[PDB]
Amino acid sequence: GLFGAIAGFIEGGWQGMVDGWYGYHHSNDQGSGYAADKESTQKAFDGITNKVNSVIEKMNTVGKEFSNLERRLENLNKKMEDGFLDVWTYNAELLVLMENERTLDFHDSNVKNLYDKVRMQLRDNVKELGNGCFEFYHKCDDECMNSVKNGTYDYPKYEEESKLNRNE
C-alpha cells in the first residue's frame, strides 16, 4: 500500500514477533531475536482506539398506525423512516470502508517511519540491504543494539572503525 513498507520493501510479517505490531530483529554473536517496539505499538493502538471511539460517539444518537383514508400520510411516514435508514446505513458502511483504508495505511506509515528512524540513525556505518535489514560494518553488541532500538545510537563512536571495513 501507500508508504510501501508493509507488503513493501519489507516483504512479509513476523509470526515471531508476538509482543507488538512493529519491532526489530537482530542477530549478533551474543545472540539473535525478535523485539517489539512497545512505544510505537501502544501509540498506534491509542490512535486506533480514538478512531473507533469517535465512530461510536458520532453515531450514538416506535411505530405509528394509519387509517385507509390516511394513505398519503402513512406513506410519508414510511418514506421518512426509510430515508433516514438509508442515510445512516450509507454513512456507516462508508465510514467503515474509508477508515479501514486509512488504518491499513497508518500501520504502513508507522513501519516506514520506524525503519526510517533506524536508517537515519545508523547512516553509513551499515550496509542497507533493502529487505528491511541493515548489516553493520562494525561489531554491534547487545548494548549497541539496544542503543539503536532506544534511539541513542552513537555514530562517531563506531565511525572510522566502520569506515575501514567498508573500504577494505
Ligand X SMILES: *[C@@H]1O[C@H](CO)[C@@H](O)[C@H](O)[C@H]1NC(C)=O
Among 103, 109, 113, 146, binds ligand X (CB under 6 A): 146
Least distance CB 149 / ligand X (angstroms)? 8
Cα separation of the two ends of the chain: 39
Name the minimum Å distance from CB 61 to ligand X: 44
Stretch that binds ligand X, among 11-19, 102-110, 128-136, 139-147 (CB under 6 A): 139-147
Q: Which residue is nearest to ligand X (CB)?
A: 150
Find the DSSP H helices in 1-70.
38-59
The least CB distance from residue 147 to ligand X, in Å, is 4
In three-state secondary structure terms, 134 is strand
The closest of 123, 99, 110 to 5, measured between CA atoms, is 110
Residue 38 CA to residue 41 CA, distance in Å, equals: 5
| Binding piece for ligand X, criterion CB under 6 A, among 23-31, 36-44, 129-137, 141-149 | 141-149
Identify which of residues 17 and 140 has a Cβ nearer to ligand X in the complex: 140
Nearest C-alpha neighbor of 30 from the set 140, 160, 157, 137: 140
Which residues sit at the interface with ligand X, rule CB under 6 A?
143, 146-147, 150, 152
